[PDB]
């Protein structure tokens, strides 16, 4: 679970949710509020 994803050498000590729909997703998971830090099958 320790490997996950959040631009051209973009970096900060921060991360935020993708608007996969019109919703203001508040970082919260849901249908068309899909969580950005998806777990990896490592």
């Amino acid at each position: 679970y320790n490997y996950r994803y959040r631009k051209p050498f973009e970096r900060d000590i921060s991360t935020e949710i993708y608007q996969a729909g019109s919703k203001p997703c508040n970082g919260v998971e849901g249908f068309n509020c899909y969580f950005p830090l998806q777990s990896y099958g490592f």
Binding site: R4, Y5, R6, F9, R11, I13, T15
Partner: protein, 49 residues
């Protein structure tokens, strides 16, 4: 990959032909330079991201 280590390799010398010959990597490629030439390079830094 979000917190990716922007390691500013700096104030130093190396051999890169060893990296190019190394079996340690499943992939190795160079873009602005062809990978045989790398021992002839000099830089301000290398950000080993």
């Amino acid at each position: 990959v979000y917190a990716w280590n922007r390691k500013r390799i700096s104030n130093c010398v190396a051999d890169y032909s060893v990296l190019y010959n190394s079996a340690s990597f499943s992939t190795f490629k160079c873009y602005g330079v062809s990978p045989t030439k790398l021992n002839d390079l000099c830089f301000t830094n290398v950000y080993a991201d």
